[PDB]
């Protein structure tokens, strides 16, 4: 998704899925959308992806492959990575000092 999103920088990577593999390569068909096409800007079921926070979502880990690879799941198995492993690491390593010390 990263290499495709760099190739089509004007498109938003929606999803991707395995189609084929061999010894050397793995093949993935990656679904993309045109966020400035009027069929996507209208028809409000799909106009969430032309919102400017969803651009290059595959480079941040927002897609399902990224949500898997970041370990973002509910559970006791995912205590390090609940809202992001660096967000938890900041939260658990900050020394939160108050005005009246505890």
């Amino acid at each position: 998704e990263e290499r495709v999103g760099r190739r089509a920088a004007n498109l938003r990577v929606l999803n991707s899925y395995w189609v084929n593999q061999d010894s050397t390569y793995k093949y993935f068909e990656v679904i993309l959308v045109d966020p400035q096409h009027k069929a996507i800007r209208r028809d409000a079921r799909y106009n969430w992806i032309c919102d400017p926070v969803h651009k290059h979502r595959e480079a941040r880990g927002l897609t399902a492959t990224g949500k898997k690879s970041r370990g973002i799941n509910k559970g006791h198995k995912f205590n390090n990575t609940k809202a992001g492993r660096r967000k938890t690491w900041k939260r658990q390593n900050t020394l939160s000092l108050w005005r009246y010390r505890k």
Partner: peptide, 13 residues
């Protein structure tokens, strides 16, 4: 660790 980079003091309480 480098805790001094991550001291959050709640003056805004």
């Amino acid at each position: 660790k480098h805790w001094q980079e991550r001291v959050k003091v709640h003056f805004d309480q």
